UniProtKB/Swiss-Prot annotation, chains A, B:
A cellular-component GO term for this protein: protein-containing complex
Phenotype upon changing S259A: Reduced activity
Organism, as annotated: Escherichia coli (strain K12)
Record's keyword terms, sorted: Acetylation, Hydrolase
This protein's record includes keyword Mitochondrion: no
Modification N6-acetyllysine occurs at: K293
Binding site for substrate: S65, N116, E160, N167, Y191, Y243, V261
Annotated consequence of substituting N116A: Loss of activity
Protein's name according to its UniProt entry: Glutaminase 1
Entry-linked Gene3D superfamilies: DD-peptidase/beta-lactamase superfamily
């Protein structure tokens, strides 16, 4: 890959979109509400371990629901794809991230590991002897996939843990229906923790690059996932990673992606690179306004789309 | 490509799955109920125009909802991708092929050109001065995409036109909500006609190969679609092509696909080939039991999956 073209792509995406108005920070906890709204970054991490970025690319923001990708990756390593498909699902819900209508319409089955209900079920599916081991193994895979500096924010975790009533409900609905594989409050607790780590845009792009490299983190030169597991992760992302706007994302960008309420957007170019961006203001679907545009811009400038031969 | 590998894949898929038990013929009209249940075929058509087949690959079956792809293609040519996204949508519904719950939960918007509601809306969006021109233009693009012998069955059409009450309802719901772009009964009629053409398994594979070649029919060597429009078609197929099992399809196979109740299964390997299979007995989601397995088998043997780098 041409280093000049890659650096130009992130530079131009940043220049074109970094100050674009629109959207609002997540504000259900003060930490998210208080993140300076003008911060903005975009980065590429290639399968060969080269890194290109623009903007506030070291600024560490809350992982939040991007954590769903990492725990999914672990569940696949632990129990394999058939078990994940049977116990969690592989289908989009057509409904918001926290939709209980979705559950009741599918007999309690969460359908996707990337909506909150599926993610809580996937967290409960991880091999673990007790709650702290469950957390330790999830924290470790996040560090393996995105970088060793990824770490729990006490402030974010304390805020999330004391406001997550609707996820407590979801955990009990899953448990009641047969779609939760450990104690309900353990699952809810660990799910909350996994959302409460902090990473920067380069680290997010690294998660992408690990997936693009078929499970090898190109910065640490370490195989974290089995290659054969990666397409399942990316398929799940294509179907639901941007919630109700996943189809719009597939239509416009054509790369498997994931958003979080910290303002992160990840996309994967299979075999080639991770692309990520960050900016706190979110659209009505919970997806970073600028983050989406900056990732789409890089992908469009470099000609990457899995629906283009 | 390795022609020996392609023929071997088709032959092994057919051997392995052509007599697999399961499912039942669509039977809501007598034509579909009476098609011999044991018929089965699989085929590849490549971007270079080579054809590899096994089984009853000359047998002509009803196109049915696979027609939704051709009409989407024509709508993109006529009004472009922004207009399709605004007037029809690009998102999966989470709900069955004929779901009116899906409509009412999204304020009347059909969400996807590949569910019945969106397909009727897409048929209504096509440029036309009257109903017969609307039909002629749609028939012509089916023939351009899949093969010149594609033609309306009077018997299928008559049976569909006299039993399509639920689609008449959907047409009126769209019209009432503002998501129908011509007369309601004209859109419903023409949608019915487009579903009532007959094609064989090589023609269905050719449809896929036209898409795979970026809009060029590799048997006639004619450009039918703009290359830039094809990724939109494929994204829509990835989201909703196999209805509520599209996610499962993306997870297991990882190629954009489409089913119809005539027993056809289509998959597209972007830039490489169309893969198709046929067998009348359908599963509970309306998807051919053997058809899905044969197409999946060819794709796995050859290693094709858009999420694998």
């Amino acid at each position: 890959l041409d280093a000049n073209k890659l650096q130009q792509a992130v530079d131009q995406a940043y220049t074109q979109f970094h100050s674009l108005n629109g959207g609002q920070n997540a504000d259900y906890i003060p930490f998210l509400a208080n993140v300076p709204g003008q911060l903005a970054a975009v980065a590429i991490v290639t399968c060969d371990g080269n890194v290109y970025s623009a903007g506030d690319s070291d600024y560490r923001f809350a992982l939040e629901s991007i954590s769903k990708v990492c725990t999914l990756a672990l569940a696949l390593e632990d129990v394999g794809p058939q078990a994940v498909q049977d116990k969690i699902g592989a289908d989009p819900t057509g409904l918001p991230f926290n939709s209980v209508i979705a559950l009741e319409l599918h007999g309690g089955k969460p359908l996707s590991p990337l909506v909150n209900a599926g993610a809580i079920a996937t967290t409960s599916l991880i091999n673990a002897e007790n709650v702290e081991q469950r957390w330790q193994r999830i924290l470790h895979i996040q560090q393996q996939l995105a970088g060793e500096q990824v770490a729990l924010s006490d402030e974010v975790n304390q805020s999330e843990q004391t406001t997550n009533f609707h996820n407590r409900a979801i955990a009990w609905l899953l448990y009641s229906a047969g779609y939760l594989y450990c104690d309900a409050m353990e699952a809810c607790d660990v799910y909350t923790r996994q959302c409460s780590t902090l990473l920067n845009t380069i680290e997010l792009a690294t998660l992408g690059a690990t997936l693009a490299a078929g499970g090898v983190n190109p910065l640490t030169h370490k195989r974290v996932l089995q290659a054969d597991n990666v397409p399942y992760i990316l398929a799940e992302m294509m179907m639901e990673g941007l919630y109700g706007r996943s189809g719009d994302w597939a239509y416009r960008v054509g790369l498997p992606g994931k958003s979080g309420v910290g303002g992160g957007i990840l996309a994967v170019v299979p075999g080639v690179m991770g692309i990520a961006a960050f900016s706190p203001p979110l659209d009505e679907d919970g997806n970073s306004v600028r983050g989406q545009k900056m990732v789409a811009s890089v992908a469009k400038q470099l000609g990457y789309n899995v629906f283009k031969g």
